[PDB]
Amino acid sequence: QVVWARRMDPILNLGSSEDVEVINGGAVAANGWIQDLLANSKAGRGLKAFNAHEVVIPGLKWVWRISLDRPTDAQVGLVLLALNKMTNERIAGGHSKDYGRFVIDGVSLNGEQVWSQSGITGGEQYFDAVAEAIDGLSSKEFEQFAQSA
Amino acid sequence: MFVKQVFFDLGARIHADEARALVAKLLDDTQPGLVSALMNYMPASKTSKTEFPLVQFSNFNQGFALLGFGEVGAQILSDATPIIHDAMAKLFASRGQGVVVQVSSRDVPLSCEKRPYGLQYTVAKMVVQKKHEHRERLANPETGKVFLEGLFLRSLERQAAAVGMVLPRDLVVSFKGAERVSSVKLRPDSTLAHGSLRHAVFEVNARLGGLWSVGFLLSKGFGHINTDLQLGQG
RNA sequence: GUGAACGGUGGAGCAACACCUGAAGGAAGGCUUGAUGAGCGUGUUCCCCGCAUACGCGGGG
Numbered sequence: 001q002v003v004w005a006r007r008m009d010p011i012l013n014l015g016s017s018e019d020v021e022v023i024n025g026g027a028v029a030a031n032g033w034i035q036d037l038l039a040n041s042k043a044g045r046g047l048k049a050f051n052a053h054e055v056v057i058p059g060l061k062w063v064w065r066i067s068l069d070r071p072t073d074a075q076v077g078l079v080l081l082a083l084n085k086m087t088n089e090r091i092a093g094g095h096s097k098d099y100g101r102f103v104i105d106g107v108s109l110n111g112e113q114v115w116s117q118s119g120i121t122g123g124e125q126y127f128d129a130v131a132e133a134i135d136g137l138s139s140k141e142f143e144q145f146a147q148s149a
Numbered sequence: 150m151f152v153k154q155v156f157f158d159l160g161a162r163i164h165a166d167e168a169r170a171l172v173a174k175l176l177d178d179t180q181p182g183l184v185s186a187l188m189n190y191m192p193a194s195k196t197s198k199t200e201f202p203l204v205q206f207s208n209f210n211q212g213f214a215l216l217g218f219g220e221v222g223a224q225i226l227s228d229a230t231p232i233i234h235d236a237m238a239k240l241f242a243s244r245g246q247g248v249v250v251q252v253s254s255r256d257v258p259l260s261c262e263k264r265p266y267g268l269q270y271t272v273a274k275m276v277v278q279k280k281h282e283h284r285e286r287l288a289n290p291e292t293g294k295v296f297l298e299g300l301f302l303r304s305l306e307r308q309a310a311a312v313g314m315v316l317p318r319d320l321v322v323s324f325k326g327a328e329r330v331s332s333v334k335l336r337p338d339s340t341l342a343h344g345s346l347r348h349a350v351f352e353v354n355a356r357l358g359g360l361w362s363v364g365f366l367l368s369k370g371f372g373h374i375n376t377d378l379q380l381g382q383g
Numbered sequence: 384g385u386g387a388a389c390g391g392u393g394g395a396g397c398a399a400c401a402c403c404u405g406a407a408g409g410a411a412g413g414c415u416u417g418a419u420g421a422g423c424g425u426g427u428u429c430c431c432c433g434c435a436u437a438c439g440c441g442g443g444g
Contacts, residue, residue, distance in 0.1 A: 004416065005414055005415090005416090006415070006416055006417075007413090008414085008415055008416095008417075012251060013415095013417095014249050014251070015160075016160075017246050017247055017248055017249060020249055026247060027247040027248060027249045028238065028247075031234065031235070031238040031242075031250055034234060034250065034251070034252055035231045035234055035235060037252070038230050038231050038234065038252055038254075041254050042227035048414090050416075092411085093411095094413085095411090095413085096412085096413060096414075097414095154420085156419080162423095196430090196431060196432085196443075197431095197444065198432085198443070199431080199432040199443050200442090202443080210419095214420095253419070253420095255419080273421095278427090279442085280428085281428075282439095284427085303441090331424090331425070331426075332426035333424095333425065334424095334425045334426085336444085339425095339429085340426095340428090340429090341426095341427060342425070342426050342427055342428095343426090343427080343444095344426075344427085345425090360420095365443090365444095366444070368443085368444075369444070378420055378421070383421090
């Protein structure tokens with residue numbers, strides 16, 4: 001669906017002078033801004049533009065493939081720990097519009113289903129391996145990975 | 150071509166002729182070319198032009214509106230809108246707590262096409278009386294119907310020739326009915342008045358696609374309405 | 384009647400073998416489709432502009 005979003009000019013919708021008493025100067029600064037907007041409109045970018053953005057419709061089922069090139073089980077456990085609390089994050093999206101929200105309907109580990117409503121059930125050796133690898137995870141490997149010769 | 154329509158929101162409604170007199174009184178001390186532009190005066194004297202005036206006042210629910218016809222009227226309104234808005238801002242910031250003046254602007258194109266079926270148009274607060282001969286025409290409906298026919302057709306032709314676009318000359322108009330008859334006074338507390346028609350309905354085979362002004366006292370804010378709202382009314 | 388006259392540069396031969404364009408990398412941060420144009424006051428002869436050339440027509444407020 002093409003979803004249309006428009007930005008309103010704020011001081012085009014004041015109405016009363018009680019809303020402008022927080023603006024320094026008062027009505028005079030808003031009137032000068034209105035004069036500048038008029039000089040822009042007769043002829044520097046303005047505000048309250050109208051735009052559209054195509055989005056994928058919600059409620060449909062997707063598919064994701066995460067392949068591994070001969071992994072250690074700590075790495076598989078790292079990917080499954082990402083998949084366990086994946087629901088807190090967003091896929092791409094417009095952050096303001098709360099786009100990219102999703103639930104995981106399933107996780108197939110080499111063809112077998114390991115996902116339930118309470119996260120990932122199964123693949124226990126990957127979780128013990130990543131629990132062993134998270135312990136003792138120091139900065140020293142990151143330092144001499146990022147160090148440039 | 151195209152016309153321009155600029156609305157000034159003040160928070161309180163002031164009439165079109167009263168706003169005309171107000172911007173005549175307020176901008177008079179300074180900038181004489183600009184008021185000579187907006188009240189369509191002669192370049193040398195204070196007398197207004199006898200031709201079609203390009204910029205005319207209109208009706209706004211929260212203030213007053215200005216209409217600039219053609220490129221010249223649009224340019225005049227474009228150079229005059231910030232000065233008018235600043236004058237209103239200083240005038241209503243001098244007294245009271247002070248209000249904020251809102252603006253709006255529209256560029257409505259003009260178009261006309263001839264169709265082989267009648268079309269309905271209602272005009273509110275149109276002035277048709279100027280002389281004693283028109284009053285003698287108004288007493289008898291048979292000689293007054295043709296007068297309204299010629300007045301509507303000549304107003305349409307004058308506006309089409311003033312804006313700079315060609316109008317087909319085979320248009321057959323008709324005048325069906327009237328709701329009220331009232332009077333219009335150019336200056337308050339004056340004995341002289343002009344007869345005016347309230348909620349006239351007219352029927353013309355052609356269609357119109359913008360603001361069209363008919364009748365006399367067009368500048369004062371009389372006898373104009375948008376045909377774009379009235380075609381497909383709602 | 385050219386110190387002329389006459390006289391084959393010929394036969395055969397593989398540019399071919401092997402070689403990862405590849406590693407890493409967020410299209411995003413913000414943004415009311417909501418209005419705007421729809422209805423609301425004046426009660427009788429006062430200036431000025433053209434066609435005429437005044438018998439009158441159009442027309443500015």
